[PDB]
Swiss-Prot record, chains A, B:
Active site location: 44 (cysteine sulfenic acid (-soh) intermediate), 137 (for phospholipase activity)
Protein name: Peroxiredoxin-6
Residue list for modification N6-succinyllysine: 206
Region (Required and sufficient for targeting to lysosomes and lamellar bodies): 28-37
Phosphothreonine, modified sites: 41, 174
Outcome of swapping residue 29 to A: Loss of phospholipase activity, but no effect on peroxidase activity
């Protein structure tokens, strides 16, 4: 389907906000293209529920959310009412991000999104719970591929956006389980001399059995 | 590289514990094959260390771990002493799971683990932080694709593993940000009659604008 560094295909599809071209929609912002099996289903409701609640948190960082399903734009709007309702807001047919129409599976097939078990009422497969994170350069920066049985972690989605943006801006990398604000690791390539000069906040090396000096933390720049 | 449902290639790999055929290593347990860009580097070390600290929680649930990079099995052995040190354990070259040697980028290109922004001294590119989850039947149940810069979240890996196993034995499905133990969603195509019989702990349905009966909560079966 898709792999790291690949450019986003500049597709055209109908969405709850009209037909559009992907790159045009994305413009000059990071983008999160995520998929969900089917409208009018429980997990997908909690997911898009959560995603709408988190939208300002994403917009503030110049990230554009856009969903996608094998349902119709009609279906989308009808379900948005259910969405706005689920999370206790006014039941319009509007959301803080478009939902993409993909009944004919053009995008599903191409992007490699198809759930192996899940099917509509005609036995035709639907998408899984996919996330693509696109940099402003239109290149894939991170992706996630979850089954329809297992809802995603949206906090984690937010976390990694934050890390992708930091590590784009600063010559560091975030360790396992990193939380926003925590220490980060100094890139293994940057020599001791340039590291002090590059991280005034402090540069702490952990001494190892191999006596190599790679294991180096520094406060979030 | 790999889509949901696809069968794990029964490859041969040289690891820190010997040569193996993949399926035989798995036997009939769930498998987590995961890649990191390079030995003797800071994020990777944090990752495998954390992995090694979790290995009991995965094993008590019939999940085998198997790590992998481009580094030599000679490297892997040395760096395990650092992994172990980092964990504050006796710095042997022993780890609760093996590490594949992909010197040749053979499984890397196979499973599509190649990273876009990271290479070794010799020019050749390396793997990014990918995780494949395989069921006892050797099928991709879940996968994630993180870049060199962004450490993974291993508590989320364990979480989706819990979910994958739950939803495979019970006809439910976990919502966004479901914590192990939290209540789960009733599968939407289960009839109320059959559902009341399936979930004695109770089924709880939130009326919505659409009047549809799909948003049904039940305590974890």
């Amino acid at each position: 389907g898709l792999l790291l560094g690949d450019v986003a295909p500049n597709f055209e599809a109908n969405t709850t906000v009209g037909r559009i071209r992907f790159h045009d929609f994305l413009g000059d912002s990071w983008g999160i293209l995520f998929s969900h099996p089917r409208d009018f289903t429980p997990v997908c409701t909690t997911e898009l529920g959560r995603a709408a609640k988190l939208a300002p948190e994403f917009a503030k960082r110049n990230v554009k959310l856009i969903a996608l399903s094998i349902d119709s734009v009609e279906d989308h709007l009808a379900w948005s009412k259910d969405i706005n309702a689920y999370n206790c807001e006014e039941p319009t047919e509007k959301l803080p991000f478009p939902i993409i129409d993909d009944r004919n599976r053009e995008l599903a097939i191409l992007l490699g999104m198809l759930d192996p078990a899940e099917k509509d009422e005609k036995g035709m497969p639907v998408t899984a719970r996919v996330v693509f994170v696109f940099g402003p350069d239109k290149k894939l920066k991170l992706s996630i591929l979850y089954p329809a049985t297992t809802g995603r972690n949206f906090d984690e989605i937010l976390r990694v956006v934050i890390s992708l943006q930091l590590t784009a801006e600063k010559r560091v990398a975030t360790p396992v389980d990193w939380k926003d604000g925590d220490s980060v690791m100094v890139l293994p390539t940057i020599p001791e001399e340039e590291a002090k000069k590059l991280f005034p906040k402090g540069v702490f090396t952990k001494e190892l059995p191999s006596g190599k000096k790679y294991l180096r933390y520094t406060p979030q720049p």
